[PDB]
Amino acid sequence: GSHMEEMIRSLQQRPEPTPEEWDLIHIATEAHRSTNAQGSHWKQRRKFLPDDIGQSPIVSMPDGDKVDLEAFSEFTKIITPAITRVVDFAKKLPMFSELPCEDQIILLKGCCMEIMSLRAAVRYDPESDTLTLSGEMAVKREQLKNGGLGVVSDAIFELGKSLSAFNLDDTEVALLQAVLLMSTDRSGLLCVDKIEKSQEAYLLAFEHYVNHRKHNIPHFWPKLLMKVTDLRMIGACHASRFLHMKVECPTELFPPLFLEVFEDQEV
Ligand SMILES: Cc1cc(OCC(=O)O)cc(C)c1Cc1ccc(O)c(C(C)C)c1
């Protein structure tokens, strides 16, 4: 390019975001920051789930990993604001909010657990070996496992542990969420092509943002893509388990928003 342009790009090889992509990045980043219930201190801040909760799984589940009702109830108590914030996030992306209402609902149902799991995982704390839920509750593996998630707990913890070394910033988290959200791997969508074009736009912007960041761990982009796949697997395991739960447990134990968002892979 021009002489100044060349000087500035001297140590970039790879494609940077275009100005249009920078706008997309800026909007998504701010959408995430404003909805992630995370200030400046998120660690020193809030609270561990008491040690004596989550050690007593006694409700049966088909896979043999029983549920501790007390821990389950502690989790459902905080889950409604977590779900709500995912919706708040999505509503702030123009490519999402311009979709038919019915498509918006399908996309939210499709990715809600994926995004919640990512948000918990990025708050993994190696020192205490905890995840943080709804931005306030720190939990141990056993507590989250016994409190209803079973093997899904192990999967989120393993993701959180592995993500520590990626040093993701708010933008990278936000773009991961946008890619999870704008997926056509759901049934009943009207605007399939538009949603796919949006996902393609986010993916390319995200790849370019990763180039911009110059991470010092190698193969960063495909490594991050593999984590997207892990999150989708977490979402699928959760969907299967949630069906089970509803078979096992009375409806009064499930907040209405919790029931609504995790509808339909059988119930
Ligand atoms: C309750 C909780 C909230 C959390 O929020 C993440 C975010 O808002 O930052 C993210 C995680 C993964 C869950 C744990 C959870 C997620 C799904 C689910 O069905 C259950 C039942 C056992 C009540 C628990």
CA distance 100 to 65: 40
∠ CA(243), CA(267), CA(144), 5° rounding?
A: 25
Q: Which strands form 137-139's sheet, in the order they lie side by side?
A: 47-48, 137-139, 131-133
Give me ligand 1 centre to Cα 80, in Å.
Answer: 9
- The conformation of residue 187, written as its DSSP 8-state character, comes to S
114 token code pair? 């994926």
CA distance 206 to 202: 6
Secondary structure element (H or E) that encloses residue 139, with its range: strand 137-139
CA distance 173 to 98: 22
Q: How far is CA 170 from the centre of its chain?
A: 12
Give me ligand 1 centre to Cα 26, in Å.
Answer: 27
CA distance 96 to 259: 22
CA distance 140 to 118: 16
Closest CA to 72 of 254, 243, 234, 237: 254
CA distance 8 to 130: 42
CA distance 123 to 120: 5
Ligand 1 proximity of 117 Cβ (cutoff 6 Å): yes
Q: Among the atoms of ligand 1, which is closest to the Cα of residue 123?
A: 9
Per-domain residue ranges of the chain: 1-267
> Do the Cβ atoms of 118 and 177 come closer than 8 Å?
yes
Closest CA to 258 of 55, 89, 97, 86: 86
Q: Among the atoms of ligand 1, which is closest to the Cα of residue 262?
A: 19
CATH topology of domain 1-267: Retinoid X Receptor (1.10.565)
Give me ligand 1 centre to Cα 2, in Å.
Answer: 51
At CB < 8 A and 24+ separation, what contacts does 51-56 make? 53/143, 53/147, 54/139, 54/140, 54/142, 54/143, 54/144, 54/146, 54/147, 55/142, 55/143, 55/146, 56/146
Q: Of the residues 45, 61, 75, which should be mutated to test ligand 1's pocket, given the most ligand atoms within 8 Å of the CB?
A: 75
Closest CA to 259 of 247, 234, 242, 244: 242
247 token code pair? 């078979």
CA distance 94 to 88: 12
Ligand 1 proximity of 116 Cβ (cutoff 6 Å): yes
Closest CA to 133 of 187, 77, 179, 212: 77
Ligand 1 proximity of 150 Cβ (cutoff 6 Å): no
What residue's CA is closest to ligand 1, atom 5?
Answer: 134
Please give the C-alpha separations between residue 253 and each of 33, 74, 206, in angstroms, as whole numbers: 31, 11, 39
* Size of the chain in residues: 267
Q: What is 40-98 written as a DSSP string? A: S-STTTSEEPPTTSS----B--TTS--B-HHHHHHHHHHHHHHHHHHHHHHHTSHHHHT
Ligand 1 proximity of 160 Cβ (cutoff 6 Å): no
Please give the C-alpha separations between residue 94 and each of 22, 52, 111, 201, 233, in angstroms, as whole numbers: 15, 45, 17, 13, 27
Q: Among the atoms of ligand 1, which is closest to the Cα of residue 78?
A: 1
Beta bridge partners of residue 138, listed in sequence order = 48, 132
| 134 backbone φψ class: left, alpha, beta (φ>0; ψ -120 to 50) | left
* CB neighbour list of residue 11: distance below 8 Å, 6 or more residues apart: none
SS3 267: coil
What residue's CA is closest to ligand 1, atom 16?
Answer: 113
> Do the Cβ atoms of 97 and 195 come closer than 8 Å?
no
Cα dihedral 160/162/164/165 (nearest 10): -170
Q: What is 120-185 written as a DSSP string? A: HHTT-BTTTTBEEETTTEEE-HHHHIIIIITHHHHHHHHHHHHHGGG---HHHHHHHHHHHHS---
Q: Of the residues 42, 67, 80, 134, which should be mutated to test ligand 1's pocket, given the most ligand atoms within 8 Å of the CB?
A: 134
Resolution for this PDB entry, in angstroms: 1.9
